[PDB]
Write an enzyme that holds these catalytic residues in place. Structure first.
Site, PDB file in Angstrom:
ATOM      1  N   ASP A  25       0.780  -1.235   0.000  1.00 29.52           N
ATOM      2  CA  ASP A  25       0.000   0.000   0.000  1.00 29.52           C
ATOM      3  C   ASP A  25       0.817   1.293   0.000  1.00 29.52           C
ATOM      4  O   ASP A  25       0.287   2.339  -0.368  1.00 29.52           O
ATOM      5  CB  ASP A  25      -0.912   0.051   1.235  1.00 29.52           C
ATOM      6  CG  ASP A  25      -1.936  -1.068   1.273  1.00 29.52           C
ATOM      7  OD1 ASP A  25      -2.419  -1.504   0.210  1.00 29.52           O
ATOM      8  OD2 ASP A  25      -2.279  -1.495   2.391  1.00 29.52           O
ATOM      9  N   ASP A  59      14.965  -6.398  18.786  1.00 31.22           N
ATOM     10  CA  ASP A  59      14.109  -6.428  19.957  1.00 31.22           C
ATOM     11  C   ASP A  59      12.683  -6.364  19.489  1.00 31.22           C
ATOM     12  O   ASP A  59      11.853  -7.162  19.894  1.00 31.22           O
ATOM     13  CB  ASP A  59      14.438  -5.253  20.884  1.00 31.22           C
ATOM     14  CG  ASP A  59      15.844  -5.330  21.433  1.00 31.22           C
ATOM     15  OD1 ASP A  59      16.166  -6.358  22.067  1.00 31.22           O
ATOM     16  OD2 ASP A  59      16.622  -4.372  21.243  1.00 31.22           O
ATOM     17  N   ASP A  71       2.055 -17.408  14.867  1.00 35.41           N
ATOM     18  CA  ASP A  71       1.758 -17.148  16.269  1.00 35.41           C
ATOM     19  C   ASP A  71       0.291 -17.535  16.554  1.00 35.41           C
ATOM     20  O   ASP A  71      -0.396 -18.025  15.658  1.00 35.41           O
ATOM     21  CB  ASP A  71       2.050 -15.683  16.627  1.00 35.41           C
ATOM     22  CG  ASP A  71       1.035 -14.699  16.046  1.00 35.41           C
ATOM     23  OD1 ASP A  71      -0.061 -15.101  15.604  1.00 35.41           O
ATOM     24  OD2 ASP A  71       1.341 -13.496  16.073  1.00 35.41           O
ATOM     25  N   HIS A  84      -1.312  -6.201  15.999  1.00 34.52           N
ATOM     26  CA  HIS A  84      -1.060  -6.505  17.399  1.00 34.52           C
ATOM     27  C   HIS A  84       0.441  -6.540  17.661  1.00 34.52           C
ATOM     28  O   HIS A  84       1.233  -6.666  16.732  1.00 34.52           O
ATOM     29  CB  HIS A  84      -1.714  -7.832  17.797  1.00 34.52           C
ATOM     30  CG  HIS A  84      -1.347  -8.983  16.907  1.00 34.52           C
ATOM     31  ND1 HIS A  84      -2.257  -9.596  16.072  1.00 34.52           N
ATOM     32  CD2 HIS A  84      -0.175  -9.637  16.730  1.00 34.52           C
ATOM     33  CE1 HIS A  84      -1.657 -10.570  15.409  1.00 34.52           C
ATOM     34  NE2 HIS A  84      -0.395 -10.623  15.797  1.00 34.52           N
ATOM     35  N   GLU A 102      -5.712  -5.217   5.640  1.00 29.83           N
ATOM     36  CA  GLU A 102      -6.172  -3.845   5.823  1.00 29.83           C
ATOM     37  C   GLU A 102      -5.463  -2.942   4.821  1.00 29.83           C
ATOM     38  O   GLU A 102      -4.491  -3.352   4.196  1.00 29.83           O
ATOM     39  CB  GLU A 102      -5.870  -3.354   7.240  1.00 29.83           C
ATOM     40  CG  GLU A 102      -6.501  -4.196   8.348  1.00 29.83           C
ATOM     41  CD  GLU A 102      -7.983  -4.441   8.119  1.00 29.83           C
ATOM     42  OE1 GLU A 102      -8.664  -3.569   7.535  1.00 29.83           O
ATOM     43  OE2 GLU A 102      -8.465  -5.518   8.515  1.00 29.83           O
ATOM     44  N   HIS A 119       0.703   3.262  18.465  1.00 32.48           N
ATOM     45  CA  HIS A 119      -0.101   2.470  19.402  1.00 32.48           C
ATOM     46  C   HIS A 119       0.520   1.089  19.652  1.00 32.48           C
ATOM     47  O   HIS A 119       0.681   0.676  20.800  1.00 32.48           O
ATOM     48  CB  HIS A 119      -1.526   2.290  18.865  1.00 32.48           C
ATOM     49  CG  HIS A 119      -2.408   1.459  19.745  1.00 32.48           C
ATOM     50  ND1 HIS A 119      -3.235   2.009  20.697  1.00 32.48           N
ATOM     51  CD2 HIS A 119      -2.601   0.119  19.810  1.00 32.48           C
ATOM     52  CE1 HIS A 119      -3.878   1.044  21.331  1.00 32.48           C
ATOM     53  NE2 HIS A 119      -3.516  -0.112  20.808  1.00 32.48           N
ATOM     54  N   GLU A 120       0.845   0.376  18.574  1.00 35.40           N
ATOM     55  CA  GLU A 120       1.453  -0.943  18.698  1.00 35.40           C
ATOM     56  C   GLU A 120       2.779  -0.897  19.473  1.00 35.40           C
ATOM     57  O   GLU A 120       2.997  -1.709  20.366  1.00 35.40           O
ATOM     58  CB  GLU A 120       1.651  -1.612  17.319  1.00 35.40           C
ATOM     59  CG  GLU A 120       0.367  -2.108  16.649  1.00 35.40           C
ATOM     60  CD  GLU A 120      -0.670  -2.674  17.623  1.00 35.40           C
ATOM     61  OE1 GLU A 120      -0.310  -3.467  18.531  1.00 35.40           O
ATOM     62  OE2 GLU A 120      -1.855  -2.311  17.483  1.00 35.40           O
ATOM     63  N   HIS A 123       2.541  -1.031  23.150  1.00 32.10           N
ATOM     64  CA  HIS A 123       2.453  -2.426  23.607  1.00 32.10           C
ATOM     65  C   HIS A 123       3.823  -3.105  23.631  1.00 32.10           C
ATOM     66  O   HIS A 123       4.160  -3.796  24.591  1.00 32.10           O
ATOM     67  CB  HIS A 123       1.508  -3.252  22.728  1.00 32.10           C
ATOM     68  CG  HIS A 123       0.057  -2.890  22.867  1.00 32.10           C
ATOM     69  ND1 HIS A 123      -0.533  -2.622  24.081  1.00 32.10           N
ATOM     70  CD2 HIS A 123      -0.931  -2.796  21.945  1.00 32.10           C
ATOM     71  CE1 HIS A 123      -1.815  -2.367  23.900  1.00 32.10           C
ATOM     72  NE2 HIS A 123      -2.081  -2.457  22.611  1.00 32.10           N
ATOM     73  N   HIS A 129      -3.932  -1.371  27.167  1.00 30.80           N
ATOM     74  CA  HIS A 129      -4.914  -0.360  26.793  1.00 30.80           C
ATOM     75  C   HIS A 129      -5.316   0.549  27.943  1.00 30.80           C
ATOM     76  O   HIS A 129      -5.309   0.147  29.105  1.00 30.80           O
ATOM     77  CB  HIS A 129      -6.154  -1.015  26.165  1.00 30.80           C
ATOM     78  CG  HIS A 129      -5.867  -1.665  24.858  1.00 30.80           C
ATOM     79  ND1 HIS A 129      -6.326  -2.919  24.528  1.00 30.80           N
ATOM     80  CD2 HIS A 129      -5.109  -1.255  23.816  1.00 30.80           C
ATOM     81  CE1 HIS A 129      -5.880  -3.247  23.330  1.00 30.80           C
ATOM     82  NE2 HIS A 129      -5.147  -2.249  22.870  1.00 30.80           N
TER      83      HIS A 129
HETATM   84  C1  LIG Z   1      -4.458   0.500  16.366  1.00 30.07           C
HETATM   85  C2  LIG Z   1      -4.524   1.822  16.753  1.00 30.07           C
HETATM   86  C3  LIG Z   1      -5.283   2.169  17.859  1.00 30.07           C
HETATM   87  C4  LIG Z   1      -5.375   3.568  18.324  1.00 30.07           C
HETATM   88  C5  LIG Z   1      -4.817   4.655  17.703  1.00 30.07           C
HETATM   89  S1  LIG Z   1      -5.303   5.937  18.499  1.00 30.07           S
HETATM   90  N1  LIG Z   1      -6.144   5.197  19.615  1.00 30.07           N
HETATM   91  N2  LIG Z   1      -6.124   3.947  19.401  1.00 30.07           N
HETATM   92  C6  LIG Z   1      -5.963   1.178  18.552  1.00 30.07           C
HETATM   93  C7  LIG Z   1      -5.901  -0.141  18.150  1.00 30.07           C
HETATM   94  N3  LIG Z   1      -5.142  -0.484  17.056  1.00 30.07           N
HETATM   95 CA   LIG Z   2      11.620  -9.550  19.571  1.00 33.30          CA
HETATM   96 CA   LIG Z   3      -8.182  -7.847   9.162  1.00 35.51          CA
HETATM   97 ZN   LIG Z   4       0.919 -11.913  14.901  1.00 33.90          ZN
HETATM   98 ZN   LIG Z   5      -3.769  -2.106  21.330  1.00 32.18          ZN
END
Ligand SMILES: c1cc(-c2csnn2)ccn1
Ligand SMILES: [Ca+2]
Ligand SMILES: [Ca+2]
Ligand SMILES: [Zn+2]
Ligand SMILES: [Zn+2]
Length: 167
Positions: A25, A59, A71, A84, A102, A119-120, A123, A129
């Site tokens: 994309d 990492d 996974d 994720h 997507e 966001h990712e 995590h 969250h």
């Molecule tokens: C990707 C992005 C987000 C997000 C961006 S801003 N607030 N939540 C949530 C879940 N997955």
């Molecule tokens: Ca790793």
């Molecule tokens: Ca999807």
């Molecule tokens: Zn995965």
């Molecule tokens: Zn999330």
């Protein structure tokens, strides 16, 4: 001796990442730019440093994939699941996966790769969250144009890594 820490977090300030493959994309440069900026979101409010690797084990390993991709969190084709990432930890810990069913963009269209990556990577660094609908780590994606990391996220990440240089 050493007991296990209070929270999942990286025990080092220097982190590496690798973009393992690329979405159709966007151009390579757009992807690289979006991830660089998404990492900068976190490094700007912490003492964390992020270095990119072009090969080898990082990492935070970044990849685009579909369906079953190695996974227990397989993607669902177009719509639904989106991306994720794994909390800090051995092996796949820190890794971030994006669903290539997507559409990924550097615009208000589809899903903004920068916003979702930011966001990712939260995590990947140890944030789950937030209940604050304005926070970056709120579970549901919304597009925002301007970027200022919301205070809920600044407090969250700094609880883990400290502020680094406050000015
Ligand atoms: C990707 C992005 C987000 C997000 C961006 S801003 N607030 N939540 C949530 C879940 N997955
Ligand atoms: Ca790793
Ligand atoms: Ca999807
Ligand atoms: Zn995965
Ligand atoms: Zn999330």
């Amino acid at each position: 001796y050493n007991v296990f820490p209070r929270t999942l977090k990286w025990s080092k300030m220097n982190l590496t990442y690798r973009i393992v493959n690329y979405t159709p994309d966007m151009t390579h440069s757009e992807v690289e730019k979006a991830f660089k900026k998404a990492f900068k979101v976190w490094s700007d409010v912490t003492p964390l440093n992020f270095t990119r690797l072009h090969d080898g084990i990082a990492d935070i390993m970044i990849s685009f994939g579909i369906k079953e991709h190695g996974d227990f969190y397989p993607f669902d084709g177009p719509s639904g699941l989106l991306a994720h990432a794994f909390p800090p930890g051995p092996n796949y810990g820190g890794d971030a996966h994006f669903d290539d069913d997507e559409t990924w963009t550097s615009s208000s269209k589809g899903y903004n790769l920068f916003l979702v990556a930011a966001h990712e990577f939260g995590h990947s660094l140890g944030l789950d969250h937030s209940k604050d609908p304005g926070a970056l780590m709120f579970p549901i994606y919304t597009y925002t144009g301007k970027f200022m990391l919301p205070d809920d996220d600044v407090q969250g990440i700094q609880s883990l890594y400290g502020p680094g240089d406050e000015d």
